């Protein structure tokens, strides 16, 4: 049982040790393409690169590289694309990926500016009347509407392939109060957000994988995906207590390095899954409780 595992770790003061063990056991795969000199301006951080085996390839002959990885969770039957916050010169690549991968939703867990420093480009329009055109990939992006809540914002965007003239509605789920290398204000606020993404239909297998990002696409991003996949497994398995969150995280790390960046983020992931499980195990009244507890504007 996760509650028992959580207490065992918490009471012994072993979070740093458990987390460091996961880091030590994590997969080590090559990232040769990410390191090619010509790709230097496509990486936000020198210490965060996608593995070659799981990287997302752009469908262009020029240069198919983007710092993004496909996290394919076989048993959970869900895939996610984790990517860095787009750079000024990779915003067109980012939307090209969204288009090509048939994604319906984009989950952003960081702010454009954090601690007086730029952590992600302003890759979507802030005003309806000021749409964006990405010349390099021939895509147009328009803000259709946005619903701003106390700690997160949901936006409806229209993405158009200017080559084929076809358009698609993309849902943007922006968590605006999650500090870098920090944790959500509470399991409640996090789960309320996660279930909003779920209820939107964006994570449905009928769509391409949801695109999840933070500044590097590994810390807050890994937390989001780890919680979601664990809950998926608990709903799917005969014995939900058989889900080992540490093993799920190691499985995810076979696809992208460094998922979950701090011991406290790992600790928070346990709390988020333990709380979310109360809903999966029936008692769907907790969902309204998180809603109320989140104080979403």
């Amino acid at each position: 049982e996760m509650e028992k595992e959580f207490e065992q770790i918490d009471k012994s003061g072993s979070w740093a040790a458990i987390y460091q063990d996961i880091r030590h056991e994590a997969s080590d795969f090559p990232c040769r393409v990410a390191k090619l000199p010509k790709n230097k301006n496509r990486n936000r951080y020198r210490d965060v690169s996608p593995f070659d085996h799981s990287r997302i390839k752009l469908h262009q002959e020029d240069n198919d590289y983007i710092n993004a990885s496909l996290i394919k969770m076989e048993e959970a039957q869900r895939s996610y694309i984790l990517t860095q916050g787009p750079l000024p010169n990779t915003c067109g690549h980012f939307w090209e990926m969204v288009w090509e991968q048939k994604s319906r939703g984009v989950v952003m867990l960081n702010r454009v500016m954090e601690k007086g420093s730029l952590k992600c480009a302003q890759y979507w329009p802030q005003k309806e009347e000021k749409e964006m055109i990405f010349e390099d990939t021939n895509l147009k992006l328009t803000l259709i509407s946005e619903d701003i809540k106390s700690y997160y914002t949901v936006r409806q965007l229209e993405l158009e392939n200017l080559t084929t003239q076809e358009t698609r509605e993309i849902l943007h789920f922006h968590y605006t109060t999650w500090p870098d290398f920090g944790v959500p204000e509470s399991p409640a606020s996090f789960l309320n957000f996660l279930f909003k993404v779920r209820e939107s239909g964006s994570l449905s297998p009928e769509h391409g994988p949801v695109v999840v990002h933070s500044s590097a696409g590994i810390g807050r991003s890994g937390t989001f995906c780890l919680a979601d996949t664990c809950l998926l497994l608990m709903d799917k398995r005969k014995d939900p207590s058989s889900v080992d969150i540490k093993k799920v995280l190691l499985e995810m790390r076979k696809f992208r390095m460094g998922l979950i960046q701090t011991a406290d983020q790992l600790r928070f992931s346990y709390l988020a899954v333990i709380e979310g499980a109360k809903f999966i195990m029936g008692d769907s009244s907790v969902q309204d409780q998180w809603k109320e507890l989140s104080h979403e504007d």
Binding site: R44, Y45, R46, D47, V48, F181, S215, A216, I218, G258, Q261
Partner: peptide, 8 residues
């Protein structure tokens, strides 16, 4: 060079 992680 820009780094995401802490090495201090």
């Amino acid at each position: 060079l820009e780094f995401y992680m802490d090495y201090e």
